[PDB]
Amino acid sequence: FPQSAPHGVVFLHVTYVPAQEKNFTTAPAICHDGKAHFPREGVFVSNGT
Amino acid sequence: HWFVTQRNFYEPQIITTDNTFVSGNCDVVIGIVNNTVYDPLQPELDSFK
Amino acid sequence: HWFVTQRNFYEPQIITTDNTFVSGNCDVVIGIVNNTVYDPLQPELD
Ligand SMILES: *[C@@H]1O[C@H](CO)[C@@H](O[C@@H]2O[C@H](CO)[C@@H](O)[C@H](O)[C@H]2NC(C)=O)[C@H](O)[C@H]1NC(C)=O
Numbered sequence: 001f002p003q004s005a006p007h008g009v010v011f012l013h014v015t016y017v018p019a020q021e022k023n024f025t026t027a028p029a030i031c032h033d034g035k036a037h038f039p040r041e042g043v044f045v046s047n048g049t
Numbered sequence: 050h051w052f053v054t055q056r057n058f059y060e061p062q063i064i065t066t067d068n069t070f071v072s073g074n075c076d077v078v079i080g081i082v083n084n085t086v087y088d089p090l091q092p093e094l095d096s097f098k
Numbered sequence: 099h100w101f102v103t104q105r106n107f108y109e110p111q112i113i114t115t116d117n118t119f120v121s122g123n124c125d126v127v128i129g130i131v132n133n134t135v136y137d138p139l140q141p142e143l144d
Pocket residue numbers: 083
């Protein structure tokens with residue numbers, strides 16, 4: 001949102017910074033019965049099991 | 050009905066699993082549309098069995 | 099035969115509906131070449 005100032009302009013950039021994160025046992029891909037699979041939007045993760 | 054078209058030239062297309070991928074669930078989906086698509090495998094099996 | 103390859107490297111593949119979408123009616127485009135794609139459902143009903 002722009003904001004006027006005397007002989008200048010002041011912005012109010014609204015950002016989106018990720019908060020706390022957890023560690024996961026990712027993997028490049030996945031395959032069942034001899035058929036490699038790949039992620040389509042995100043990245044694979046693992047709850048642990 | 051809905052279409053899937055590129056972002057620079059209007060090319061309306063029949064939404065299909067051909068050019069669409071799934072990474073979520075209706076519960077997780079907001080304003081989910083109870084809208085169906087075409088699967089090019091069901092009618093063929095019943096016709097020729 | 100007709101093959102679908104990536105942009106830079108040359109890696110031919112069997113032209114399949116999984117790697118190609120549909121649009122239009124083929125009656126308006128120019129340069130269309132008649133060809134057959136593979137339907138995976140055929141072996142499942144033999
Ligand atoms: C899309 O389908 C969902 C499937 O549950 C519908 O959700 C239910 O719709 C019925 C319709 O009478 C309601 O009684 C339920 O309360 C809804 N929720 C559940 C958990 O059953 C949803 O309404 C459908 N959307 C539209 C626009 O019809």
